[PDB]
Amino acid sequence: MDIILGIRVQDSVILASSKAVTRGISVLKDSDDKTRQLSPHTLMSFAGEAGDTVQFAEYIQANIQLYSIREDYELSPQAVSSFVRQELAKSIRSRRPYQVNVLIGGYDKKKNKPELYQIDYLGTKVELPYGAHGYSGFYTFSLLDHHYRPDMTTEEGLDLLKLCVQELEKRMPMDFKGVIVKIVDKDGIRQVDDFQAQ
Amino acid sequence: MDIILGIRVQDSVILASSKAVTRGISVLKDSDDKTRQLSPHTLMSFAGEAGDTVQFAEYIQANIQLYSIREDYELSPQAVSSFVRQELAKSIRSRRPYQVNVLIGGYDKKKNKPELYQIDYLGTKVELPYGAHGYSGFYTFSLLDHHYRPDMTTEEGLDLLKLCVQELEKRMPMDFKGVIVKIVDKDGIRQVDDFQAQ
Amino acid sequence: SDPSSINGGIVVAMTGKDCVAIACDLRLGSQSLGVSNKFEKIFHYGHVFLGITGLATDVTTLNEMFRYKTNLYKLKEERAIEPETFTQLVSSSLYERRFGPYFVGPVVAGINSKSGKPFIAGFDLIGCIDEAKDFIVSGTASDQLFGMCESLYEPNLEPEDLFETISQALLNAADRDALSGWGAVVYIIKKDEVVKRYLKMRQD
Amino acid sequence: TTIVGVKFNNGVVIAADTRSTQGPIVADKNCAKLHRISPKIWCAGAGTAADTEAVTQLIGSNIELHSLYTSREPRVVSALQMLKQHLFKYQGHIGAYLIVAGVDPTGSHLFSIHAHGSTDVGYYLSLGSGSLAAMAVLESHWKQDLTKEEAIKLASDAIQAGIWNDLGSGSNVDVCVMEIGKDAEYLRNYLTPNVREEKQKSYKFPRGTTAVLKESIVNICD
Amino acid sequence: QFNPYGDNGGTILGIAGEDFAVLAGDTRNITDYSINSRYEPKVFDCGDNIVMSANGFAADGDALVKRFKNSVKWYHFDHNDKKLSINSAARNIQHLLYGKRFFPYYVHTIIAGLDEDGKGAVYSFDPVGSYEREQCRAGGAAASLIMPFLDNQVNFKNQYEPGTNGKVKKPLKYLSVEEVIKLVRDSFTSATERHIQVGDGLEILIVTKDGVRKEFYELKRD
Amino acid sequence: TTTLAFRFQGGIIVAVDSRATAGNWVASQTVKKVIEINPFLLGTMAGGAADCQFWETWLGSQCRLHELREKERISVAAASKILSNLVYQYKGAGLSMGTMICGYTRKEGPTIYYVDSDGTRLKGDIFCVGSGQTFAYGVLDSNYKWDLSVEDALYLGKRSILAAAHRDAYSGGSVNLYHVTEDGWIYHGNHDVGELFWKVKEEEGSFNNVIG
Amino acid sequence: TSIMAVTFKDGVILGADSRTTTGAYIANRVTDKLTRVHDKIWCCRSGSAADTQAIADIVQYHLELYTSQYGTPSTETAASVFKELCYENKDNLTAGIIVAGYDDKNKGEVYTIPLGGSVHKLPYAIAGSGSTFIYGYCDKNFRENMSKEETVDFIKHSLSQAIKWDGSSGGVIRMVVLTAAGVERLIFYPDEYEQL
Amino acid sequence: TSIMAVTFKDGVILGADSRTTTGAYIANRVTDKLTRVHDKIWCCRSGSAADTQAIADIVQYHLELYTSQYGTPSTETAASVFKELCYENKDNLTAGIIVAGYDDKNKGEVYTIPLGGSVHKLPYAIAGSGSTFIYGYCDKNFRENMSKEETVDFIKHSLSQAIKWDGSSGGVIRMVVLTAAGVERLIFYPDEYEQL
Amino acid sequence: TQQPIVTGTSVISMKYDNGVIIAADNLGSYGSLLRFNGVERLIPVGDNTVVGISGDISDMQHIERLLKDLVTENAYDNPLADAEEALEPSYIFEYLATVMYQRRSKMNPLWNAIIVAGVQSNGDQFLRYVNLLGVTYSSPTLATGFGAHMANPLLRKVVDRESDIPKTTVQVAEEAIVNAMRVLYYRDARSSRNFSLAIIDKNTGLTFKKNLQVENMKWDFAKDIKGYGTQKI
Ligand SMILES: *C(=O)[C@]1([C@@H](O)[C@@H]2C=CCCC2)NC(=O)[C@H](CCO)[C@]1(C)O
Ligand SMILES: *C(=O)[C@]1([C@@H](O)[C@@H]2C=CCCC2)NC(=O)[C@H](CCO)[C@]1(C)O
Ligand SMILES: *C(=O)[C@]1([C@@H](O)[C@@H]2C=CCCC2)NC(=O)[C@H](CCO)[C@]1(C)O
Ligand SMILES: *C(=O)[C@]1([C@@H](O)[C@@H]2C=CCCC2)NC(=O)[C@H](CCO)[C@]1(C)O
Secondary structure, three states: OOOEEEOOOEEEEEEEEEEOOOEOOOEEOOOOOEEEEEOOOEEEEEEEHHHHHHHHHHHHHHHHHHHHHOOOEEEOHHHHHHHHHHHHHHHHOOOOOEEEEEEEEEOOOOOEOOOOOEEOOHHHEEEEEEEOOOOHHHHHHHHHHHHHOOOOOHHHHHHHHHHHHHHHHHHHEOOOEEEEEEEEEEEEEEOOOOOOOO | OOOEEEEEEOEEEEEEEEOOOEEOOOEEEEOOOOEEEEEEEEEEEEEEOHHHHHHHHHHHHHHHHHHHHHHHHHHHHHHHHHHHHHHHHHOOOOOOOOOEEEEEEEEOOOOOOOEEEEEOOOOOEOOOOOOEEEOOHHHHHHHHHHHHHOOHHHHHHHHHHHHHHHHHHHHHOEEOOEEEEEEEEEEEEEOOOOOOOO | HHHHHOOOOEEEEEOOOOEEEEEEEOOEEEEEEEOOOOOOOEEEEEEEEEEEEEHHHHHHHHHHHHHHHHHHHHHHHOOOHHHHHHHHHHHHHOOOOOOOOOEEEEEEEEOOOOOOEEEEEEEEEOOOOOOOOOOOEOOOOOOHHHHHHHHHHHOOOOHHHHHHHHHHHHHHHHHHEEEOOOOEEEEEEOOEEEEEEOOOOOOO | OOEEEEEEEOOOEEEEEEEEEOOOOEEEEEOOOEEEEEOOEEEEEOOHHHHHHHHHHHHHHHHHHHHHHHOOOOOHHHHHHHHHHHHOOOOOOOOOEEEEEEEEEEEEEEEEEOOOOOOOEEEEEOOOHHHHHHHHHHHHHHHOOOOOHHHHHHEEEEHHHHHHOOOOHHHEEEEEEEOOHHHHEEEEEEOOOOOOOOOOOOOOOOOOOOOEEEEEEOOOOO | OOOOOOOOOOOOEEOOOOOOEEEEEOOOOOOOOOEEOOOOOEEEEEOOOEEEEEOHHHHHHHHHHHHHHHHHHHHHOEEEEOOOOHHHHHHHHHHHHHHOOOOOOOOEEEEEEEEOOOOOEEEEOOOOOOOOEEEEEEEEEEHHHOOOHHHOOOOOOOOOOOOOOOOOEEOOOOOOOHHHEEEEHHHHHHHHHHOOOOEEEEEEEEEEEEEEEEEEEEEEOO | OOOEEEEEOOOEEEEEOOOOEOOEEEEEOOOOOEEEOOOOOEEEOOOOOHHHHHHHHHHHHHHHHHHHHOOOOOOOHHHHHHHHHHHOOOOOOOOEEEEEEEEEEOOOEEEEEEEEEEOOOEEOOEEEEOOHHHHHHHHHHHHOOOOOOHHHHHHHHHHHHHHHHHHHHOOOOOOEEEEEEEEEEEEEEEEHHHHHHHHHHHHHHOOOOOOO | OEEEEEOOOEEEEEEOOOOOOOOOOOEEOOOEEEEEEEOOEEEEEOHHHHHHHHHHHHHHHHHHHHHHHHHOOOOHHHHHHHHHHHHHHOOOOOOEEEEEEEEEEEEEEEEEEOOOOOOOEEEEEEEEEEHHHHHHHHHHHHHOOOOOOOOOOOOOHHHHHHHHOOOOOOEEEEEEEEOOOOOEEEEEEEEEEHOO | EEEEEEEEOOOOEEEEEOOOEEOOEEEEOOOOOOOEEEEEEEEEEOOHHHHHHHHHHHHHHHHHHHHHHHHOOHHHHHHHHHHHHHHHHOOOOOEEEEEEEEEOOEEEEEEEOOOOOOOOOOOEEEHHHEEEHHHHHHHHHOOOOOOOOHHHHHHHHHHHHHHHHOOOOOOOHHHHEOOOOOOEEEEEHHHHHOOO | OOOOOOOEOEEEEEOOEEEEEEEEEEEEEEEEEEOOOOOOOEEEEEEEEEEEEEEEEHHHHHHHHHHHHHHHHOOOOOOOOOOOOOOOOOHHHHHHHHHHHHHHHOOOOEEEEEEEEEEEOOOOEEEEEEEEOEEEEOOEEEEEOOHHHHHHHHOOOOOOOOHHHOOOOOHHHHHHHHHHHHHHHEEEEOOOOOEEEEEEEOEEEEEEEEEEEEOOOOOOOHHHHOOOOOOOO
16 A cells, blocks of 8 residues: 555644656556645545545545635644544445545634544544554564654654654565655645755 | 576686565565585575475585585586586476475586576576576566676676666565675686675 | 466477478466567487477476487487487487376477478377477467367478468467467478578567 | 277277367367277376376287287286276376276176276276267167167267267267177278368468568477 | 357358459358258348458347347438448448447457449458458358458568568559459368368359359358 | 657657567558658557557547637647546546647747556657657667757657567568648658668668668 | 066066157157177166166176176176276266176076166166056055066056156167076057056 | 155045154154145145145135135146246245045046146156155056045055155055045054054 | 257258249257147248248247247238238348347347258248257258257258259158158157248248147157177067
């Protein structure tokens, strides 16, 4: 599977996602952005089955944007994650389930706190300081369990992730072609265009 | 499978072999030398089943060294490859066959010409200007078919391989952790300790 | 899976007026991957020729085995082995591995040194002999070869004519077979001389 | 394949078609399914060709050696016993289905052996995919006390039923007659009802049609 | 368990001439090693100067041809008796086949006629609707035996100008209906010699600006 | 099969082989692997001939309906998603297709979308699909430059299919070339690999291993 | 197959149909399922034709060597040799054999060796696919110490019923009579037993 | 199971064993396999107990509604309703049913509906695993136009043989006599039929 | 999808100068058990057609019902039902063929092999086959199952091609068929000695013969055969 990582620091949530898209024997793309902005302060990363992955992401995106327009309001990260969990929990018992795992990082403007939600394809949701899907957790969780602190700055979070990615690049068999990193905070979502050598 | 490449230029044979050794979920080593010197002017690279790989290589090495002592002579590269082919051709119809593929690069001091032999685990031997095992050929043969010339210098050969390795590092899904390169010529076998950035 | 469809290749032999011809492609692949364009499938022991299609390792092994056996034969018999006798040696050698056969399709061609009579024969992987008077086909494009031969062939062709026929049979069969091609070689055989010609064909 | 055996007043006759197949392709349009075990004991084989040939020659070899050792003419029941015990031992893995017939000091005999080693005795028999077309004719025209000529005809007609109606059979009809007081007579291609019509055109190529890259003489002399 | 498919053998051939086109097919219908019929037409005149053959599983072939003829009928009903051009029939057939993409008509179908410029035309289809306009195409059992031949004798593949050192390809002069028929007949007599499913008879349908004509020739019955 | 498409200064180059095989049987050496969706859109075919041919032709019908409805040329993004979404509805049914949707619109410029029967839709600059893809990628990756000239680009594509036709048993026959400009695509001929190979060998010096 | 052996006043009679099938095809319609392993010790064969022949042939060989050394063997000894072969090779054999012999001291005796290789001595025995249909009939009509004529009749009627219902049984009905008087071969054609 | 229906001079008699097994265990040893679907139209059930009950129950329902509208149904009509159910649902049913009824115009009639759902009118019919053993016996002893006593005897002997050889058959033998005189229920215990 | 339970074996037939003949034995097998003996597998439709059925018997009975309905239905509002608008053999066949193919296409076949024999209104002979796969074909002779392997070869010795039909008389034809029925009784383990035969002649109409029997069988030579190789007594 692809690398999907997320960390919640003092005032933001950071998502790192691998850029490679491999189909069989070849790496078809090495600049894939496995993410969709659900609202100005909510970002979702995903990994899983070839077509289901984007179809699900865009489907959720469409629904959130529709809600935003109807209510002229932005749903809280918690509300968005529950909506997503329910969608997956329905899918798991349907004819052909969505085989998609997601990380939802959002900044709650009402509580003024960043939030990170991990939800697998079965509709299993949990809220965490940091999380991942697939084998990613196996290589990185020991590092995060060690260096993580609730008061970390965005800069400290980026340094911890960098460390995680390095461990992944050393011990993981597959070349995921680096990661795209995005920060979600009180001001929105921005992409760290400089992680190829930060 | 691992990367096993070989090219025969004007006055030498060059073998490039990946350094990674992956067991399951982890890359256990990234400095593995998948080669055995069979005699002063003959080198053999190999890839295949976990334990069979080295057991076969060392078994062949033992036999050639024994022959060298008994006859106080060094068998021609062609003679060594035929011996190896026969061993594999026996193995393929035995209780538990050696699942090993090899490239045999040697410099024939009598003919004063380098020679490259490709032999798969079935005992299928062929002599070539360049060859490989596994998926390696799929990514590199189009480059070799293009830039190869019988009069290439050792330096030109190394540049062509470098190109091949770069293509492999771009399109192949697995991280093989680079390659160790060795030259076989009238003076013996030496290792290019500088290919990590040649 | 099928040992006879891994490396690919074809061989075809024909009889003519006081002559015989045996031809083969030069490909050696690993399924879709082409590996060698110089893998000849024809060999000869004295004046007797043998072409082998099928699993490459067995093709190589069989040639080495027959070289070995025909050498000892010459040493004891004090004469080179003949087409008819060799054919019998091939058959019994293959049947000897009846329940663990070599995955090959052998083809014998030659002229009896004493009777001057042209001779060709084919075998299945376990030795069954097929002694045709016209032609014999073997390989991954054998259906195509049967098609070419059954139409193109006619009796008593002269060496120069048989050459054109055998070549057209080979070439057009190989171009309808994904695993055959990448070069071809034809052997025109007469009581006194043997000419070997490499053909020019597509390389895809 | 269509093979048959028919007893007549003073001997036995066996016949067979000449088609050999590899799946739906005809590998040999004129193979020989009639084998000799000894001078006067012939065999018709169906099933795996390499097997019928190999098994026929093996027992044939031992039968010859037995004959030399006993100073007696080989008997059909001996070839039968050696064949069945050999086939039984290989549990059917040697795909030989045979119709063994011949004359010896005790008279004329007709038997059939299946790959698994079981044998049968009868006045008329047939094996192979053409077996049913052939047997239909035998069950319709056989009668006791056939003359040699009648037997050849019946047998020959049985093979034809197979050539024409069975896709597994075709080409020609081979026959072998074994009469009690005479030499066995092998009639190769006793019938050839399937000659190919003249082709519509000649495909003889004008010399030079084929592109040649390199040419050379091959050394045959040591 | 129940298998909805079967294989009735047969081989069909379509060749497009410059201003004519032929669609031939043997008349033998089989099941395993038995002949169901020595004469069961497999190539049909579907009106509007279009001939069609769907070879493979006969029940499927019949259903398709029957559905297509009915398509031509309604084309007339719905488009003021307009003539269905060969290219339009081809596209229509693609949809007929693709309609059963998940429970295919187990056939290789080929239609022949003249395009809108009066030129000879042949179209061959996939069991699932993939199609291409082609010069000539053999379909069915012996397809692998015939195509190589045609590449050589119709498109002059691998044939060069004597003396040019294979530097000059033999010129593509085009064949007459008589020369084409010869190739067709030799193609089938050859296939009949090596394939057990090919034989009994050959029926050719020729299409010209004057309509559809039929010719018939016997093939070996073994 | 070997099909490729790449973006460059002069638009898009699309090159495909023309071989069709069922097992080891070469069903054809003259198959079309490029669908002319319409005068401005090209589609490549890899995998199932019927699936590609059928749905890509249908795609054209949908594109045409769009332009009649919106009185404006359809975007490559939108045309590709129509096929993508259709194919996704069938996910699991067994469709088999590896495809490249190519166009050049004023709004988007040269655009290529890889679309397969798994439902994957990827925008990119270089794509190769088929059993010969790895061979074409090798040639393409080492000679591709955004500033290639239309003449040189056309050759790169032709050469890349040649590399694949040579090594891949399932690729060959001939090469069909296309150039896609904002004003439409320009067909650039059918090149028999048989002849193309010897020519390229002599003129280029490559394929030194093959005796000519 | 339909085979049976019946002991009576003067000895014992063996009977059998003459059909061997390979699927729906009748490979042989005049088969002889009654096999001699000694002058007055015969057997009825069912199951594999190849297996039962090989077994019978070996038993005959054994009883011949037995005779050469110890004189004529008892029917029990013959059934024992059959058993040894069938039991010890149960994994590779499919043979249902009825052994029947005539001794002067013991008169007629019948031993049935079913699939597993067990032995069962009985007044009479039936076996073969066709026997399933005549269990009731045979059990109702068999009597001990019947005459040669009665016994031939019992067998003839029993087997005709077996042949009637069993597609695997057919052809002619063969019988072998074993008494002090010697060995007699009987055969009954369709036209006779079908209308019983 | 062993079941049979036999037509005779005065009508028809149905008979059956009373054993239902689940493997080697006898779940019920006093089972009643003779089921009424109308006053003088009964059936014999074999195969699935659940399937045959559901079928019978539905047939009874159908014949009751038939009677309400068109009066008493013919035995043939009853066999047809059974058939419709068995044929149309052949994939999900395992039912071997013998239908037997007494008409004044037609007297006794017997229809056997085997597994596939086909119908067969016969003078008498046998079914159930146990029937295989009495094919010969029944074919030799059945006669048309027998008396009530003879018919009861034929059935009693036939079934006792079936129960004898078939482990799936046993218990008591039940019979149902259908004549103009009405409906009579007969039962025979082991101690009686075992020593026949 | 299903599996046949009670089955009928071969159905053989051929056409002669003035009509067609068709026959089938009276057995209904149940696996290897020759269970039913009064089964008629020749179904006459009107007086110019006979449908011979092999395979599953419950399905055969179903086809019987379908056939009776066709007759009833064709009679409705049809004043020429017994004349110009009576059922032709070709109509009956196209109907069945249609049903057979629809049923295989729904993966629920009528497990049968059918042969429709008859004479068209213009006198032409009609003989066509259709089975559970919907497959159909015509030939001077036609047999199903076992008879395809053993009867066709015999019948074809009488009528090998079209030009042989006008040269064949009802006597020769009926003779060939009756002999074939005997051969089938000799080698087919699922055959019966009793059978029905029907002739549809453009002059004598439909003749339906019931309760025939294989006669003149050769079994005497069986007495001379003993052992399986070396046995002498
Ligand atoms: C007939 O038995 C058989 C023949 O090809 C061989 C050839 C030579 C001697 C033995 C008989 N054997 C087969 O396997 C074929 C049929 C396969 O279905 C064929 C042609 O019947
Ligand atoms: C290439 O993908 C392919 C071609 O036969 C088709 C033909 C026409 C248009 C789509 C491409 N597809 C296959 O399945 C073939 C290989 C099967 O092993 C082949 C030749 O690669
Ligand atoms: C009877 O048991 C059996 C006979 O063919 C053989 C023939 C000769 C001696 C042993 C008995 N055995 C079978 O396997 C046959 C049925 C095959 O379906 C048959 C007729 O039952
Ligand atoms: C008889 O067919 C059967 C009986 O248990 C049922 C019981 C009541 C009415 C229908 C017949 N069916 C079976 O499945 C039983 C055997 C299970 O191993 C038995 C006794 O044969």
